[PDB]
């Protein structure tokens, strides 16, 4: 169908981000300026947030055969935009240490945010595939932005090869699903079945290959092995973006796909996703046990947390608060990962060159960075699901969702993995306050510190008083 003016005002964050990409590119072509191009990118992202306000003033409707805009789309668009803004704020001091061109970073961040918005609004296999690719390719550039450094180049090569393989798997599964079902819309994947024949072999196989691609993208077991390497090797603001925005957007489009598709309530897919959720929780928590690297630890942490989210997804067709749980948990996980990777980014900034080491050395951080140590230990408590933190509110939502749906193996997996998480998270949080033998001055570094401090305050306040976040996520309802 055509695009009406109503369809245009619903399209506003996508249009503003695309116009920001064009404007930032033209400003780069006019003169290579770090400060003004960073300012233009963050202005475009803030304008996209206000555009989300204007979208909320409009209704919920299908802008294309491809896109559908509702409160779900607005919420996940806002999450993606917040992660992108924080990535730009963390990226400026790190890029100030950089020597080469430092504005293509902002161009790639904006294009990846555009892909995140498309995945938030994706109602089609077309927009799902295109949003995944628009997330991935600028992240190929961003992960290997410091390609002269050996670890960044290695992480770039690994992420590029493995994401190309995963996109091939996802595309082939999409093709098999389209071979079975003559329409590519989310609502039509399984409509031409009845009398208990939902388990069509070709539809199941296509959804399995799509599961392979999406589980690569979500660091789900057994498509998880890339995660600690790409997290450690990438630049620290790139690690922030890859931890938050990519996982949030892809898991949101997986929510909408499994909510809308009539094959989403298949028993075989539910059992396979339950196996993947169990293995993801247990394996990520067990593999983060003996890590001295903070970025690898956060990678295995992301594996476990996405396993918890997948547990919340399994009960989508049985309970009712699955979308609510996923929204609350994703807000909490966003703020926790923003704080933790922001502390890692601020202590790795400015860039020290491709030859110099980029080790965090979190031991004894309190004696020279007390506020950063407090922020990092608040994040470590939140990712552990400690009460008084928003991560506990998300964990409580996941546990309630699993208990309602009688997913007892998954609930026990959450308990066991949470205990293992308690071990390694508290190890980091208490190593912050020990004593170490040995081993800024601009407002952008202070802005990054303000961002991680506001994330800490949000985690604490919404852990103590989670009702505003629950009220916000409850009114962000998709089309029934």
Partner 1 sequence: MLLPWLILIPFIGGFLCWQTERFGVKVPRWIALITMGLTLALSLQLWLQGGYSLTQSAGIPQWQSEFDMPWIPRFGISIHLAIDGLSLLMVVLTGLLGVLAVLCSWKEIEKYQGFFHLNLMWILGGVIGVFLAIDMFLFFFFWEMMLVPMYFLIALWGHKASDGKTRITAATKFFIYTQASGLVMLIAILALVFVHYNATGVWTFNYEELLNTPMSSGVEYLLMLGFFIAFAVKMPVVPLHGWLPDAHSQAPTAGSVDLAGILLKTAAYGLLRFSLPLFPNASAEFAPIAMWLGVIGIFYGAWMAFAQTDIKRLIAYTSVSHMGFVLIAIYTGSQLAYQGAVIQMIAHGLSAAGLFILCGQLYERIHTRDMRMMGGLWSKMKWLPALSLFFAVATLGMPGTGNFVGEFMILFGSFQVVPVITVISTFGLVFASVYSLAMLHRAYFGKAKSQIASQELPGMSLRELFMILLLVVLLVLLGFYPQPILDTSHSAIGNIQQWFVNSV
Partner 2 sequence: MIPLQHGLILAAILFVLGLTGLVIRRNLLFMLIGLEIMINASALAFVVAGSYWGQTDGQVMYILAISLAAAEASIGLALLLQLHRRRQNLNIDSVSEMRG
Partner 3 sequence: LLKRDPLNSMMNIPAVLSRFAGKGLLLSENGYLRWYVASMSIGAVVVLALLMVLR
Ligand X SMILES: CCCCCCCCCCCCCCCCCCCC
From 20, 232, 266, 322, residue interacting with partner 2 (rule: CB under 8 A): 232
Exactly one of 412, 465, 468, 471 binds ligand X (CB under 6 A); which one? 412
Distance separating alpha carbons of residues 171 and 185, to the nearest angstrom: 15
In 3-state terms the chain splits into helix, strand, coil percentages (rounded to 5) of 75, 0, 25
d(CA 71, CA 48): 15
Rg (CA), the chain: 21
Interface of this chain with ligand X, residues 326 to 385, rule: CB under 6 A = 366, 374, 377-378, 381
User: Which of the residues 129 through 158 are near partner 2 (CB under 8 A)?
Assistant: 129-130, 133, 137, 140-141, 144, 147-148, 150-151, 153-157
Q: Could you give the residue ranges of the DSSP H alpha helices within 11-147?
A: 12-30, 34-57, 71-96, 104-121, 125-143
Closest contact distance (angstroms) between CB of 289 and partner 3 is 4
**Residue 400 near which of partner 2, partner 1, ligand X, none (CB within 5-8 Å, type-dependent):** partner 1
Contact letters for partner 1, residues 333-372 (x by CB under 8 A):
----------------------------------------
User: Does residue 436 belong to the site contacting ligand X (CB under 6 A)?
Assistant: no
Which lies closer to ligand X via its Cβ, residue 282 or residue 383?
282
Tokens of 339: 């704080």
233 binds partner 2 (CB under 8 A): yes
Q: Which of residues 162-191 bind partner 2 (CB under 8 A)?
A: 164-165, 167-168, 171-172, 174-176, 178-179, 182, 184
Per-residue 3-state assignment (H helix, E strand, C coil) for 94-107? HHHCCCCCCCHHHH
| Of the candidate residues 147, 172, 396, 433, the single one contacting ligand X (CB under 6 A) | 433
Per DSSP, 263 falls in state: G
**To the nearest whole angstrom, how small is the minimum distance from the Cβ of residue 310 to partner 3?**
13
Q: What are phi and psi of 429, to 5 degrees?
A: -65, -30
Under the binding rule (CB under 6 A), the answer on residue 408 touching ligand X is yes
Do 456 and 338 meet the contact criterion of CB atoms below 8 Å apart?
Answer: no
Using CB under 8 A as the binding rule, the residues of this chain from 406 to 435 that contact partner 1 are 411, 415, 418-419, 422-423, 426-427, 430, 433-434
Tokens of residue 410, six digits: 């998954």
CA distance 251 to 259: 12
The site for partner 3 (CB under 8 A) is made up of: 157-158, 161-162, 165-166, 169, 199, 201, 204-205, 207-209, 211-212, 215-216, 221-223, 225-226, 228-229, 267-269, 271-272, 275-276, 283, 286-287, 289-290, 420
Report the distance separating Cα 108 and Cα 451, nearest Å: 21
The residues, any chain, with a CB within 8 Å of residue 375's CB and separated by 6 or more, are 339, 342, 343, 452, 453, 455, 456
**Torsion on CA atoms 386, 283, 327, 210, rounded to nearest 10:** 180
Of the candidates 468, 438, 445, the one whose C-alpha atom is nearest the C-alpha of residue 372 is 445
Q: How far is the CB of 414 from partner 1 (least distance, A)?
A: 8
Q: Six-digit token pair at 42?
A: 């963050």
By a kind-dependent CB cut-off of 5 to 8 A, residue 374 interacts, out of partner 1, ligand 3PE, ligand X, none, with ligand X
- CA 352 to CA 383: how far, in whole Å? 29
Residue (137 or 411) nearer to ligand X, CB:
411
Closer CB to partner 2, residue 179 or residue 271? 179
CB of 123 to partner 2, least distance (A): 14
**CA proximity to 163, closest of 185, 138, 145:** 138
286 interacts with partner 1 by CB under 8 A? no
Residues that bind partner 1 (CB under 8 A): 381, 386-388, 396, 399-400, 403-404, 411, 415, 418-419, 422-423, 426-427, 430, 433-434, 465-467, 470-471, 474
Residues that bind ligand X (CB under 6 A): 282, 366, 374, 377-378, 381, 408-409, 412-413, 416, 433, 460
């Amino acid at each position: 169908m055509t695009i009406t003016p109503q369809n245009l005002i619903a399209l506003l964050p996508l249009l503003i981000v695309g116009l920001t990409v064009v404007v930032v590119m033209l400003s780069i072509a006019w003169r290579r300026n770090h400060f003004l191009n960073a300012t233009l990118s963050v202005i475009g992202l803030n304008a996209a947030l206000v555009s989300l306000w204007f979208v909320g003033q409009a209704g919920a409707m299908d802008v294309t055969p491809l896109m559908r805009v509702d409160g779900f789309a607005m919420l996940y668009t806002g999450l993606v935009l917040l992660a992108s803004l924080a990535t730009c704020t963390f990226a400026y001091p790190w890029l100030e240490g950089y020597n080469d061109n430092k504005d293509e970073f902002y161009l790639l961040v904006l294009i990846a945010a555009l892909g995140g918005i498309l995945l938030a609004n994706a109602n089609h296999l077309a927009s799902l595939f295109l949003g995944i690719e628009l997330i991935s390719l600028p992240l190929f550039g961003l992960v290997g932005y410091a390609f002269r450094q050996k670890r960044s180049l290695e992480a770039s090569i690994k992420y590029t090869i493995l994401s190309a393989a995963a996109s091939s798997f996802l595309l082939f599964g999409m093709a098999l699903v389209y071979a079975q079902s003559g329409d590519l819309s989310f609502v039509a994947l399984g409509k031409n079945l009845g009398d208990g024949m939902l388990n069509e072999p070709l539809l199941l196989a296509g959804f399995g290959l799509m599961i392979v691609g999406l589980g690569f993208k979500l660091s789900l077991v057994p498509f998880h092995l890339w995660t600690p390497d790409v997290y450690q090797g990438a630049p620290a603001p790139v690690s922030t973006f890859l931890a938050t925005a990519s996982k949030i957007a892809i898991f949101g489009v997986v929510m909408r796909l499994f909510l809308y598709a009539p094959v989403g309530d298949s028993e075989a897919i539910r059992v396979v996703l339950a196996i993947i959720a169990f293995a993801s929780i247990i394996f990520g928590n067990l593999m983060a046990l003996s890590q001295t690297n903070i970025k690898r630890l956060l990678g295995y942490s992301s594996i476990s947390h996405l396993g918890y989210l997948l547990v919340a997804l399994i009960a989508l067709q049985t309970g009712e608060m699955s979308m609510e749980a996923v929204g609350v948990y994703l807000a909490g996980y966003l703020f926790s990962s923003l704080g933790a990777f922001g502390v890692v980014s601020l202590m790795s900034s400015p860039y020290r060159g491709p030859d110099a080491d980029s080790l965090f050395s979190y031991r004894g951080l309190f004696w020279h960075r007390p506020i950063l140590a407090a922020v990092m230990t608040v994040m470590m408590l939140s990712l552990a699901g400690i009460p008084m933190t928003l991560g506990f509110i998300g964990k409580f939502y996941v546990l309630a969702v699993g208990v309602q749906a009688h997913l007892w193996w998954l609930v026990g997996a959450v308990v066991v993995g949470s205990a293992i998480g308690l071990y390694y998270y508290l190890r980091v949080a208490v190593s912050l306050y020990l004593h170490a033998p040995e081993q800024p001055s601009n407002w952008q570094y202070s802005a990054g510190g303000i961002v991680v401090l506001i994330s800490a305050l949000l985690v604490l306040v919404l852990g103590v008083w989670p009702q505003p976040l629950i009220s916000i996520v409850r009114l962000a309802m998709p089309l029934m």
